[PDB]
Amino acid sequence: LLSLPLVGSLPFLPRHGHMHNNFFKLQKKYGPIYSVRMGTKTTVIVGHHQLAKEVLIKKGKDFSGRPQMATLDILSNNRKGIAFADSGAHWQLHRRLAMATFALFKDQKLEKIICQEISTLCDMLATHNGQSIDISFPVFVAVTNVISLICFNTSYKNGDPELNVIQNYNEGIIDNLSKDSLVDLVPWLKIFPNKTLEKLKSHVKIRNDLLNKILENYKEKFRSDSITNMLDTLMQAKMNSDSELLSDNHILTTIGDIFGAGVETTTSVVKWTLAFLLHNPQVKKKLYEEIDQNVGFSRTPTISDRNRLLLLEATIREVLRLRPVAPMLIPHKANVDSSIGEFAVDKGTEVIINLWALHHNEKEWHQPDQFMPERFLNPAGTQLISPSVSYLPFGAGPRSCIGEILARQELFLIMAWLLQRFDLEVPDDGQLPSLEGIPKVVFLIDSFKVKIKVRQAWREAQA
Ligand code: HEM
Numbered sequence: 422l423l424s425l426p427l428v429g430s431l432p433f434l435p436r437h438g439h440m441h442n443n444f445f446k447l448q449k450k451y452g453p454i455y456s457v458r459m460g461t462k463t464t465v466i467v468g469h470h471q472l473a474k475e476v477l478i479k480k481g482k483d484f485s486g487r488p489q490m491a492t493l494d495i496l497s498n499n500r501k502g503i504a505f506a507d508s509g510a511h512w513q514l515h516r517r518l519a520m521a522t523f524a525l526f527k528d529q530k531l532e533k534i535i536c537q538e539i540s541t542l543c544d545m546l547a548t549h550n551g552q553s554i555d556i557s558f559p560v561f562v563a564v565t566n567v568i569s570l571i572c573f574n575t576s577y578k579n580g581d582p583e584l585n586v587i588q589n590y591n592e593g594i595i596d597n598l599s600k601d602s603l604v605d606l607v608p609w610l611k612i613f614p615n616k617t618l619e620k621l622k623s624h625v626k627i628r629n630d631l632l633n634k635i636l637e638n639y640k641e642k643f644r645s646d647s648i649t650n651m652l653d654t655l656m657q658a659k660m661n662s663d664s665e666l667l668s669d670n671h672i673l674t675t676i677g678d679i680f681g682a683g684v685e686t687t688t689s690v691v692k693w694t695l696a697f698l699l700h701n702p703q704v705k706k707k708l709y710e711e712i713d714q715n716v717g718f719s720r721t722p723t724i725s726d727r728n729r730l731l732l733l734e735a736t737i738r739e740v741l742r743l744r745p746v747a748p749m750l751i752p753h754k755a756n757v758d759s760s761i762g763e764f765a766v767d768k769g770t771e772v773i774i775n776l777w778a779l780h781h782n783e784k785e786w787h788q789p790d791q792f793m794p795e796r797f798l799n800p801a802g803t804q805l806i807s808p809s810v811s812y813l814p815f816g817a818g819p820r821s822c823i824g825e826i827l828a829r830q831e832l833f834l835i836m837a838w839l840l841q842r843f844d845l846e847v848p849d850d851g852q853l854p855s856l857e858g859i860p861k862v863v864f865l866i867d868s869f870k871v872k873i874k875v876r877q878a879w880r881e882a883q884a
């Protein structure tokens with residue numbers, strides 16, 4: 422009796438369980454690195470930090486490419502911009518300029534911009550005293566203005582419906598960009614009839630039309646004696662072309678990525694820490710104690726307070742470990758014939774870092790499935806530590822995040838201002854938010870409500 426012919430084999434079931442975790446599970450069988458082939462494309466998944474730091478750092482330039490995806494093409498306006506552009510003159514140029522712009526708010530100091538919008542955020546939420554609300558949108562508004570000031574030196578006022586329009590096409594872009602992660606085993610979208618690409622083009626069209634109208638209005642405003650924002654930095658470079666790479670679409674797409682990344686990432690991480698704090702009241706209680714002691718109510722928190730508020734800075738680290746924004750980063754591509762752990766990797770191969778596997782490695786983390794911000798503190802709780810090298814929430818090397826400083830500062834200040842001023846409790850109904858998560862291009866959390874009430878200690882300190 423003979424064996425059946427085999428036309429295809431996948432090591433696990435599609436769309437059953439999270440991809441990043443199904444891949445992780447395979448390591449028990451095949452080791453920390455292995456490959457899968459879909460027609461001609463070969464994809465390599467790396468799930469150990471040593472191999473990962475070879476791919477991202479030690480051989481950064483070799484693997485600095487991006488694979489091409491049909492969905493990403495629409496969003497990146499055919500591989501322009503930064504995040505989804507292939508390695509090349511255009512990618513490198515815009516990344517540099519973008520990084521350069523952040524210099525223009527170094528001691529309109531970035532810390533002062535952020536706290537400005539947080540103050541407005543906290544006054545809004547104070548009116549909701551005693552009510553249970555979703556805080557998604559108010560935070561969305563806060564960070565949107567920050568990124569807008571950096572890009573245009575403009576900010577939207579409360580109730581500007583352009584804010585709701587932006588919220589609408591961002592949710593639509595994220596929803597259709599990918600069912601789960603950007604890492605699909607099976608290219609379902611080229612197989613069955615679907616409106617996926619149609620829908621995406623419509624959300625993206627609206628977004629693009631909105632970014633063109635800001636550009637056309639700003640060409641009148643642009644003056645070379647003033648370089649104060651990202652859009653100035655980019656138009657200046659165009660005019661110093663005595664050029665193909667600084668076309669209107671190249672600039673537009675780049676702003677697109679920055680606007681997108683600066684909002685959806687930080688909002689999602691803010692929602693994640695609160696979710697974790699409702700589930701872990703002991704940690705939250707100690708956070709109140711901490712901030713009461715080292716900051717009090719004489720003033721509002723500042724970047725200098727990271728030195729004193731260690732349990733908070735540690736909490737944020739633990740959330741980025743447990744629920745990374747990109748649990749498989751963005752996929753990488755081999756620009757040349759190269760190797761990994763002395764295994765051959767041909768040019769054009771897709772390389773995916775399983776960051777989830779790095780952050781949940783039993784041999785690198787104690788009880789890695791548990792929320793324990795303490796793990797990033799010494800036993801005394803007197804200074805921060807780095808208990809594992811297997812930790813890359815922001816990536817590493819040529820393709821590493823470029824908003825990490827901004828990112829880290831926003832999260833710290835938002836969480837500090839809120840804890841100073843607000844009791845944040847479970848709503849009158851007994852539900853807690855599910856921590857299971859939703860894997861999109863971003864690792865999202867199901868929307869949930871939190872009862873917000875102004876702190877008694879905040880009121881009294883006004884008398
Ligand atoms: C908690 C917040 C954030 C996290 C965890 C995060 C994480 C990451 C990761 C993992 C990558 C790429 C990984 C890789 O491909 O190796 C990335 C890329 C990138 N991020 Fe962030 N990010 C955050 C916030 C931001 C912010 C605030 C900005 C503001 C501009 C930003 C802009 C970008 C850009 C433009 C890239 C792509 C750069 C390139 O491909 O060369 N991100 N981020």
Ligand SMILES: CC(=O)[C@@]1(O)CC[C@H]2[C@@H]3CC=C4C[C@@H](O)CC[C@]4(C)[C@H]3CC[C@@]21C
Pocket residue numbers: 504590591594595677678679680681682683685686746747750751862863
């Ligand atoms: C976390 C991360 O890798 C990123 O920050 C890099 C590029 C970000 C990307 C940039 C642009 C957009 C368009 C926006 O309307 C939706 C969010 C999205 C997809 C950002 C998601 C986070 C990305 C991938």
